[PDB]
Amino acid sequence: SGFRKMAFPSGKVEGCMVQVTCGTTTLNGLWLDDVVYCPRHVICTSEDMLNPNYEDLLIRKSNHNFLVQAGNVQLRVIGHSMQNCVLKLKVDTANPKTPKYKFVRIQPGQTFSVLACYNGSPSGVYQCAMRPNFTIKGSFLNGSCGSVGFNIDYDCVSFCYMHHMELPTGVHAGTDLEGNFYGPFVDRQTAQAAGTDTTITVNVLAWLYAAVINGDRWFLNRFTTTLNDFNLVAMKYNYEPLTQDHVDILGPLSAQTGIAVLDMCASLKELLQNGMNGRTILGSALLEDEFTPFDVVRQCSGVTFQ
């Protein structure tokens, strides 16, 4: 019993973090096979960040201008290339700790674990969701750039995020491992607008199912609703509209609890209109949207990894 904001074990990722230094800038890199991945703004100075011409800046750099350290192991750069917003440094040594991995571009609403790193060394691990406006509400300080987000399916590590920048609003933006930003952001120091941040409705429903599994049932009501009538109320409170694909994903949780998805939607509709009235659900006084349906099944069934 119980429910926690649970992250994946980070051991397979800790062995891939390295320190990347170009000139005077130092940030984190990801060492897989004989390639190191890192944010391309490592080649910039503080003055370049206002309006950097990355192509012109990169041409002034050679292989010997990049210093890659894996603890005390010095890797020698024998080739460099720029793919979108990431730098790919070819090194002479393949990482012996390379796990089975793939690069994945996630969709908004999906969750992943972040291994926050500084100077190539791990600081901590936490779980977060990609917001509908393609930001993340992380915990990052200066020097955390190049920290990665990931999921684990069995023996395979799926890398999905590389941290690049903190916006002036305090939220965080980054890219996939091919260097494509999530959202409309660019890697320069300028005011950038993130869109409206909405609540991930399918995740809230999954969390309400977790509450029922763990014994919290006070919010269950006798009313029901339809999909169109629920979405009319959800959009009023800046909730994402629910689709039939979302209903299909929630199927296994409906079966385990015996509560129809539309019935759970009716309970949520009353929580949106009437509030929680000083009560709590799973130790929280707010509706939580950082747990996917898969996260709930994983935590409540005990899925393990290599």
Place this chain on the structure above:
Amino acid sequence: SGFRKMAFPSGKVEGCMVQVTCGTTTLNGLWLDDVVYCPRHVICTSEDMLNPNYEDLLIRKSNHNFLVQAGNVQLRVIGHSMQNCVLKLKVDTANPKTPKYKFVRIQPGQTFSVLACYNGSPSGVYQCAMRPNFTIKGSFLNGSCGSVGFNIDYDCVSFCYMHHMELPTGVHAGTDLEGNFYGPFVDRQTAQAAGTDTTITVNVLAWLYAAVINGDRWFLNRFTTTLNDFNLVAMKYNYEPLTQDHVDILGPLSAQTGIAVLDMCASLKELLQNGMNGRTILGSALLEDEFTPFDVVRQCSGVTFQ
């Protein structure tokens, strides 16, 4: 910027988890040097749990009755002994992945990371606090027994908790690594009472300081208070009394924010009496007490580990 419930990286602990089987019971064990640590109720059947005589049950077992698996590596038991509520199995192979470690018995209010394991394999990692009544509000399923809680100081892993049982109330109880239970619990299947669970006041204050660091300042008031007048209100709301040792621990946070500890206590006193009135602090509608002063400094200054 930002603040998350952050766990330690678990890599150093993942390499120490093994599977322990005695007869038909299988749970997790901790492999350090050539000794495996596991809960002693691994030698029990389902019927023994109601009123087990561990001494009599252990005498019917020999070294070859214990099966220890480290993935696919079979460890041979060459000696066994019972220390309080843990079993110490001497094996023939020393763990090559043994990190620098120590055994520590923590005090209530301190936090640690839990590596939840099943059949010797990691499932996830989360951060929690030892409640004042010596329980933890974890996330555990059947087979998680032997999962360990830990902290990391630089290169040293401090093991502080081994999971033993879920109480009928849904909270969790366990021992230190010398086999001494935290709290008045015993390892048998019987109704057991946990005391009143109080809020860890020094942790709430540390979290309010974290909120100020991250830009949330609406709760700061113009009033002040004394230590005796605050404790009179705190005890009314089942908060732990604040002592001078707590004030000394909060010193570095007072300096960083320029807010005196007693001034922060006055803000907390108004939050206890007037509530939060639909507002949030660090994305939460409840006062949070699972962050120690050390956790706040660590997250807001970027302390790293090996």
